[PDB]
Nucleic acid binder design. Structure first.
Ligand SMILES: [Cl-]
Ligand SMILES: [Cl-]
Ligand SMILES: [Mg+2]
Ligand SMILES: [Mg+2]
Ligand SMILES: [Mg+2]
Ligand SMILES: [Mg+2]
Ligand SMILES: [Mg+2]
Ligand code: NA
Ligand code: NA
Ligand code: NA
Ligand code: NA
Ligand code: NA
Length: 228
RNA sequence: GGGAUGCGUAGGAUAGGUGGGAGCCUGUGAACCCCCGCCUCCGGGUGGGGGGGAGGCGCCGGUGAAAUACCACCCUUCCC
């Protein structure tokens, strides 16, 4: 078989040709998470954009009302008085701009990296090759750069997520854990969808949310009506 | 509609993109072996069949721009 028996059993619980309401899907996804850990709940959208047109990029952040249900280890890079701000805001690690390389050596255990704009030259210059292709390079457009570094850090530790369309024109985000109560998943799903809509490019043609699905780390998908 | 296809270099070697991922598969038949189709960058890959009857796979590390399981939405090319 393509898939093992656990997966095949889950597949029987979803009607592949049905478009579910968000409320139904939020209940259903809880039964689609039988792998041996608390699985992540995901939302995917095929977007009505031309992904090869810079002016139709979809990229941003959204604070999920119920968070991600996971720890996010944040590294901050800062200079001057901003180091203390980063540290007092709860970053797991805060390095001065001048010690970047030592981060590279092996002190590199984090889920997210933030910086202030005035260290970004050092950051890019010395960290870009590594961080960039791992989705960890701070960028203003991704909400991971700014002088409000304390606020950024707090938002990330409170379950803000990033989203950015891939170059096929699809987009994806984690939005909670399968062990969440269903109405909390429902809230998080809608929050993400609202954020996507808030980021529909002005020049995008046709239906924006062409398809939207909810799914779990190791389970099948459920197609949803994003407007419910 | 049906079926395939995804390989610069380095790296086990055939790594399309992104997101999830620390677990996954297995008497609902593991390892290994044999037959056959298709695809092929000629390395292999992929799908089916027969034997077999209990072990494979991933996380880490290494290499690399990127990492292998598994799962999700997509995209490329080809065949009929
Ligand atoms: Cl934003
Ligand atoms: Cl300062
Ligand atoms: Mg589970
Ligand atoms: Mg892949
Ligand atoms: Mg692949
Ligand atoms: Mg992937
Ligand atoms: Mg591989
Ligand atoms: Na199973
Ligand atoms: Na199951
Ligand atoms: Na599952
Ligand atoms: Na995802
Ligand atoms: Na998935």
């Amino acid at each position: 078989p393509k898939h093992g028996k656990r997966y095949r059993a889950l597949l029987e619980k979803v009607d592949p040709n049905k478009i579910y309401t968000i409320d139904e899907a939020a209940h259903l996804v809880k039964e689609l998470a039988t792998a041996k850990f608390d699985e992540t709940v995901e939302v995917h959208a095929k977007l009505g954009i031309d992904p090869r047109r810079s002016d139709q990029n979809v990229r941003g952040t959204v604070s999920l009302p119920h968070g991600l249900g996971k720890q996010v280890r944040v590294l901050a890079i800062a200079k001057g008085e901003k180091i203390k701000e980063a540290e007092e805001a709860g970053a797991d690690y805060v390095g001065g701009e001048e010690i970047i390389q030592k981060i590279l050596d092996g002190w590199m255990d984090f889920d997210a990296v933030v910086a202030t704009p005035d260290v970004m030259g050092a950051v890019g210059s010395k960290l870009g090759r590594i961080l960039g292709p791992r989705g960890l390079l701070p960028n203003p457009k991704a909400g991971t750069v700014g002088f409000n570094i304390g606020e950024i850090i707090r938002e990330i530790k409170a379950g803000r997520i990033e989203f950015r369309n891939d170059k096929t024109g699809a987009i994806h985000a984690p939005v909670g854990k399968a062990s969440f109560p269903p109405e909390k998943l429902a809230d998080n799903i809608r929050a993400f969808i609202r954020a996507l809509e808030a980021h529909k490019p002005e020049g995008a043609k046709g239906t924006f949310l062409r398809s939207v699905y909810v799914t779990t780390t190791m389970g099948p998908s459920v197609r949803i009506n994003p407007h419910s």
